[PDB]
Amino acid sequence: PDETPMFDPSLLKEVDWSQNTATFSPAISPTHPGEGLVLRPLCTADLNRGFFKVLGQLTETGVVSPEQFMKSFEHMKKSGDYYVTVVEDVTLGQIVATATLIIEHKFIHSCAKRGRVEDVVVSDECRGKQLGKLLLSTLTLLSKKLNCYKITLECLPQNVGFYKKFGYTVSEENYMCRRFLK
Amino acid sequence: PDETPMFDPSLLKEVDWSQNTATFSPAISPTHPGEGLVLRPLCTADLNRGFFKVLGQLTETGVVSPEQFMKSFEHMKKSGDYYVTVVEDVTLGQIVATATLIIEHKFIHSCAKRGRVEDVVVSDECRGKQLGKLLLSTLTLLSKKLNCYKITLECLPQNVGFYKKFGYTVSEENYMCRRFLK
């Protein structure tokens, strides 16, 4: 378990924030998430930084073993297709938000990449920090930078408005789903 | 460009075909797709068995390079996460249908895998040969055996009756989208 990021952190700091289409108030950015905050890729030491306690808020996982974490991490890391991003409160040394960008590869559209935004969560006692908006914008604009032809996500109809702020529109296509688990 | 399949063909035959819920008249299978038809992993040779001709029936496939193709294929094969499956018409040597199962890795649900179905297309002269149904049942069931806790896809509302066949249900969730290319 080390500090080695999943992707090159230059990728985040080189994102053109002028291209952000959402209302920030106060105006924050990836470079300046807020007092005592760092927006960065996930690394292996984040295991001990309450990363699962932030994910698990969204949905109760089972005890993921350290070994299991590093395998998942490494496969994701050297795929080049996962951009698991985290906000750290440095003053407490804990993770306080996370969101994932997945690059999918296709053959259609000149062998193009499309993005998927997955697993956007912000810690319960850490609302009003705009880290949801912040991660969404960052991750959205990160996919453009990675030259995705498009980027998609699922949301509840109630938050359908929250996402229009990032350039997203409601597709006429339905999301369809089959559970094997439960 | 050679016959090297993207994943193990074994994976296809080991799909528990007794678990298919969809109707087939006549009863066709991963082993018996029809007279003169084989169901297999994509391989690089497929380039000139008109793979891109079929995909062209799904969506614009700009000037695609044999090399840009070969590279993309390799990355998908190297990940172990891409299951681009095709039907060759072994007699006429052409691909006549494709669909892809992408395996997606999580940290949630005890570092679970979920699957997506993408890029389902049947050549415009393979109607009545039941290939849509077959591909969609095969990968849905392949995802089960690969241990996906769920599998999902996106379709027009009018295509809904079709995917229910394999026990997909419409989600309560909006599918939202940003296009970068136009």
Curated annotation (Swiss-Prot), chains A, B:
Reaction catalysed by this enzyme: D-glucosamine 6-phosphate + acetyl-CoA = N-acetyl-D-glucosamine 6-phosphate + CoA + H(+)
Keywords in alphabetical order: Acyltransferase, Disease variant, Dwarfism, Endosome, Golgi apparatus, Membrane, Transferase
All residue ranges annotated as the N-acetyltransferase domain in the record: 37-182
Alphabetized Pfam families for the sequence: Acetyltransf_1
Binding locations of acetyl-CoA: G128, K129, Q130, L131, G132, K133, Y163, K164, K165
Positions with a binding annotation for substrate: T59, K106, F107, I108, H109, E118, D119, V120, Y149, K150, E173, R179
EC primary class: transferase
Enzyme Commission numbers on file: 2.3.1.4
Pathway listed: Nucleotide-sugar biosynthesis; UDP-N-acetyl-alpha-D-glucosamine biosynthesis; N-acetyl-alpha-D-glucosamine 1-phosphate from alpha-D-glucosamine 6-phosphate (route I): step 1/2
Bilayer disposition of the protein: Peripheral membrane protein
Similarity comment: family membership: Belongs to the acetyltransferase family. GNA1 subfamily.
Protein name stated in the entry: Glucosamine 6-phosphate N-acetyltransferase
Species classification: Eukaryota, Metazoa, Chordata, Craniata, Vertebrata
Gene name for this UniProt entry: GNPNAT1
